[PDB]
Design a protein around this motif. Structure first.
Motif, PDB file in Angstrom:
ATOM      1  N   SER A  54      21.529 141.199  80.714  1.00  0.00           N
ATOM      2  CA  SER A  54      20.256 140.997  80.043  1.00  0.00           C
ATOM      3  C   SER A  54      19.610 142.348  79.728  1.00  0.00           C
ATOM      4  CB  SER A  54      19.315 140.143  80.892  1.00  0.00           C
ATOM      5  OG  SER A  54      19.931 138.930  81.316  1.00  0.00           O
ATOM      6  N   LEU A  55      19.330 143.094  80.787  1.00  0.00           N
ATOM      7  CA  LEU A  55      18.713 144.402  80.640  1.00  0.00           C
ATOM      8  C   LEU A  55      19.577 145.267  79.720  1.00  0.00           C
ATOM      9  CD1 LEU A  55      16.478 144.425  83.453  1.00  0.00           C
ATOM     10  CD2 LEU A  55      16.812 146.819  82.687  1.00  0.00           C
ATOM     11  N   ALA A  56      20.814 145.477  80.147  1.00  0.00           N
ATOM     12  CA  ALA A  56      21.746 146.281  79.375  1.00  0.00           C
ATOM     13  C   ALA A  56      22.003 145.603  78.028  1.00  0.00           C
ATOM     14  CB  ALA A  56      23.032 146.485  80.179  1.00  0.00           C
ATOM     15  N   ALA A  57      22.012 144.278  78.061  1.00  0.00           N
ATOM     16  CA  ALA A  57      22.243 143.501  76.855  1.00  0.00           C
ATOM     17  C   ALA A  57      21.079 143.714  75.886  1.00  0.00           C
ATOM     18  CB  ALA A  57      22.434 142.029  77.224  1.00  0.00           C
ATOM     19  N   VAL A  58      19.901 143.907  76.459  1.00  0.00           N
ATOM     20  CA  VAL A  58      18.706 144.122  75.660  1.00  0.00           C
ATOM     21  C   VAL A  58      18.782 145.498  74.996  1.00  0.00           C
ATOM     22  CG1 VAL A  58      16.303 144.802  76.009  1.00  0.00           C
ATOM     23  CG2 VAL A  58      17.052 142.472  76.613  1.00  0.00           C
ATOM     24  N   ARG A  61      21.117 145.512  71.783  1.00  0.00           N
ATOM     25  CA  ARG A  61      20.488 144.985  70.584  1.00  0.00           C
ATOM     26  C   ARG A  61      19.457 145.980  70.045  1.00  0.00           C
ATOM     27  NH1 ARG A  61      16.525 142.445  71.546  1.00  0.00           N
ATOM     28  NH2 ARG A  61      15.872 140.457  70.547  1.00  0.00           N
ATOM     29  N   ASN A  62      18.654 146.505  70.958  1.00  0.00           N
ATOM     30  CA  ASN A  62      17.627 147.463  70.590  1.00  0.00           C
ATOM     31  C   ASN A  62      18.270 148.626  69.832  1.00  0.00           C
ATOM     32  OD1 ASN A  62      14.540 147.833  72.010  1.00  0.00           O
ATOM     33  ND2 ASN A  62      15.795 146.025  72.488  1.00  0.00           N
ATOM     34  N   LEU A  63      19.228 149.263  70.490  1.00  0.00           N
ATOM     35  CA  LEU A  63      19.927 150.387  69.892  1.00  0.00           C
ATOM     36  C   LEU A  63      20.692 149.909  68.656  1.00  0.00           C
ATOM     37  CD1 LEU A  63      21.329 153.211  72.179  1.00  0.00           C
ATOM     38  CD2 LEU A  63      21.720 153.073  69.676  1.00  0.00           C
ATOM     39  N   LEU A  64      21.366 148.780  68.817  1.00  0.00           N
ATOM     40  CA  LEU A  64      22.138 148.208  67.727  1.00  0.00           C
ATOM     41  C   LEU A  64      21.266 148.137  66.473  1.00  0.00           C
ATOM     42  CD1 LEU A  64      25.251 146.936  68.103  1.00  0.00           C
ATOM     43  CD2 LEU A  64      23.967 148.105  69.952  1.00  0.00           C
ATOM     44  N   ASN A  65      20.000 147.810  66.688  1.00  0.00           N
ATOM     45  CA  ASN A  65      19.057 147.706  65.588  1.00  0.00           C
ATOM     46  C   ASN A  65      19.132 148.973  64.734  1.00  0.00           C
ATOM     47  OD1 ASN A  65      16.285 146.612  64.341  1.00  0.00           O
ATOM     48  ND2 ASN A  65      16.975 145.258  66.003  1.00  0.00           N
ATOM     49  N   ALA A  66      19.082 150.109  65.413  1.00  0.00           N
ATOM     50  CA  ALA A  66      19.144 151.391  64.733  1.00  0.00           C
ATOM     51  C   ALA A  66      20.443 151.475  63.928  1.00  0.00           C
ATOM     52  CB  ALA A  66      19.019 152.521  65.757  1.00  0.00           C
ATOM     53  N   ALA A  67      21.387 150.622  64.299  1.00  0.00           N
ATOM     54  CA  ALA A  67      22.673 150.589  63.623  1.00  0.00           C
ATOM     55  C   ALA A  67      22.547 149.776  62.334  1.00  0.00           C
ATOM     56  CB  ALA A  67      23.732 150.021  64.570  1.00  0.00           C
ATOM     57  N   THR A  68      21.636 148.814  62.365  1.00  0.00           N
ATOM     58  CA  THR A  68      21.406 147.961  61.211  1.00  0.00           C
ATOM     59  C   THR A  68      20.021 148.226  60.620  1.00  0.00           C
ATOM     60  OG1 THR A  68      20.946 146.424  62.902  1.00  0.00           O
ATOM     61  CG2 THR A  68      23.076 146.203  61.981  1.00  0.00           C
ATOM     62  N   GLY A  69      19.009 147.752  61.332  1.00  0.00           N
ATOM     63  CA  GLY A  69      17.635 147.930  60.892  1.00  0.00           C
ATOM     64  C   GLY A  69      16.895 146.591  60.853  1.00  0.00           C
ATOM     65  N   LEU A  70      17.609 145.545  61.241  1.00  0.00           N
ATOM     66  CA  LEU A  70      17.034 144.211  61.255  1.00  0.00           C
ATOM     67  C   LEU A  70      16.852 143.755  62.704  1.00  0.00           C
ATOM     68  CD1 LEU A  70      20.055 143.275  61.685  1.00  0.00           C
ATOM     69  CD2 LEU A  70      20.040 142.806  59.192  1.00  0.00           C
ATOM     70  N   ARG A  71      16.344 142.539  62.849  1.00  0.00           N
ATOM     71  CA  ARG A  71      16.116 141.976  64.169  1.00  0.00           C
ATOM     72  C   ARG A  71      17.386 141.294  64.682  1.00  0.00           C
ATOM     73  NH1 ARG A  71       9.998 139.419  63.431  1.00  0.00           N
ATOM     74  NH2 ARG A  71       9.196 141.465  62.690  1.00  0.00           N
ATOM     75  N   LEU A  72      18.375 142.118  64.999  1.00  0.00           N
ATOM     76  CA  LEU A  72      19.640 141.610  65.500  1.00  0.00           C
ATOM     77  C   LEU A  72      19.372 140.534  66.554  1.00  0.00           C
ATOM     78  CD1 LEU A  72      21.808 144.869  65.514  1.00  0.00           C
ATOM     79  CD2 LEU A  72      22.297 142.744  64.217  1.00  0.00           C
ATOM     80  N   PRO A  73      20.417 139.699  66.801  1.00  0.00           N
ATOM     81  CA  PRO A  73      20.304 138.629  67.778  1.00  0.00           C
ATOM     82  C   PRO A  73      20.362 139.181  69.205  1.00  0.00           C
ATOM     83  CG  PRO A  73      22.434 138.486  66.624  1.00  0.00           C
ATOM     84  CD  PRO A  73      21.726 139.750  66.160  1.00  0.00           C
ATOM     85  N   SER A  74      19.664 138.496  70.099  1.00  0.00           N
ATOM     86  CA  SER A  74      19.628 138.905  71.492  1.00  0.00           C
ATOM     87  C   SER A  74      20.836 138.332  72.237  1.00  0.00           C
ATOM     88  CB  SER A  74      18.330 138.455  72.165  1.00  0.00           C
ATOM     89  OG  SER A  74      18.140 137.046  72.074  1.00  0.00           O
ATOM     90  N   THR A  75      21.442 137.322  71.630  1.00  0.00           N
ATOM     91  CA  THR A  75      22.603 136.680  72.222  1.00  0.00           C
ATOM     92  C   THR A  75      23.887 137.369  71.758  1.00  0.00           C
ATOM     93  OG1 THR A  75      22.514 135.172  70.447  1.00  0.00           O
ATOM     94  CG2 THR A  75      21.232 134.538  72.287  1.00  0.00           C
TER      95      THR A  75
END
Length: 95
Positions: A54-58, A61-75
């Protein structure tokens, strides 16, 4: 790339993008665990093993966002069996 090399080069098509985001994902992920060593990380590596719940999973996504720029999925960390996949999800999310 052939003929339209320049374009391709200064065009970075999906391919490069997918291969690009991937490399990032790998690191981005590993970065979560708390290390900047991709060498000890693969594209077909299960996040679970990496140490994501969860924590690491969070953070991902957060960082991943910087990879995309959208509200990537948390799952994603869940829907994504391996990095190689993560790339896709991101690519699909980008296109």
């Amino acid at each position: 790339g052939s003929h339209m090399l320049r374009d391709r080069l200064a065009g970075l098509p999906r391919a490069e993008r997918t291969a690009e985001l991937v490399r990032l994902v790998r690191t981005s992920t590993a970065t979560v665990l708390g290390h900047d060593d991709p060498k000890a990380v693969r594209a077909t590596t299960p996040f679970k093993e990496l140490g994501f719940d969860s924590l690491a999973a969070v953070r991902l996504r957060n960082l991943l966002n910087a990879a995309t720029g959208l509200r990537l999925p948390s799952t994603l960390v869940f829907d994504h069996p391996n990095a190689s996949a993560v790339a896709g999800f991101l690519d699909a999310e980008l296109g």
